[PDB]
């Protein structure tokens, strides 16, 4: 039932590995659906080609900005931003896929992959998925981000899509 999507990560174009995720459509349908129709491209815009502009070691890896790529753009399948469907799932550990935002009800297309337990974001960020396999790719993926978050090299989503 639950949708499975993935990202083929590249470090400067040189492929590193794949990372698949499980979207919790059983908890956050609209939130999950958005990310699904964004990883496939079935609306003419998505993650394939975009990068991880903000990677903070021990914290998370952020991406989703396919328009401005500097943490300023990106959009959902319902236009610009969208509401905070709910706050039922928590940032319980590394692998968690949660929505990035600029305050409540501002969910667009940016998201982040947690590389640690980030419970302080609970109630402020909508969790909607989790790395199924490839967290090991996010290990090394995380060595390319400074304390402030600025990467050392270009971490790109070489390819992505839905498998089930």
């Amino acid at each position: 039932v639950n949708p499975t999507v993935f990202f083929d990560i590249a470090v400067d174009g040189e492929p590193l590995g794949r990372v698949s995720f499980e979207l919790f459509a059983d908890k956050v349908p609209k939130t999950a659906e958005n990310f699904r129709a964004l990883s496939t491209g079935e609306k003419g815009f998505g993650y394939k080609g975009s990068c991880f502009h903000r990677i903070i070691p021990g914290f998370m890896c952020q991406g989703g900005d396919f328009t401005r790529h500097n943490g300023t753009g990106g959009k959902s399948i319902y236009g610009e931003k969208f509401e905070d469907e709910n706050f039922i799932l928590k940032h319980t550990g590394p692998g968690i896929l949660s929505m990035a935002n600029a305050g409540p009800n501002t969910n667009g297309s940016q998201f982040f992959i947690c590389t640690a337990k980030t419970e302080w974001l609970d109630g402020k960020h909508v969790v909607f998925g989790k790395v199924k396999e490839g967290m090991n790719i996010v290990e090394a993926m995380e060595r390319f981000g400074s304390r402030n978050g600025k990467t050392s090299k270009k971490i790109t989503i070489a390819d992505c899509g839905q498998l089930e």
């Binding site: 903000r54 914290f59 998370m60 952020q62 900005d65 943490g71 300023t72 990106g74 949660s98 990035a100 935002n101 600029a102 501002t106 667009g108 940016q110 982040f112 980030t118 302080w120 974001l121 960020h125």
Partner: peptide
Amino acid sequence: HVGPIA
């Protein structure tokens, strides 16, 4: 101005 913190 999108991003998690802390």
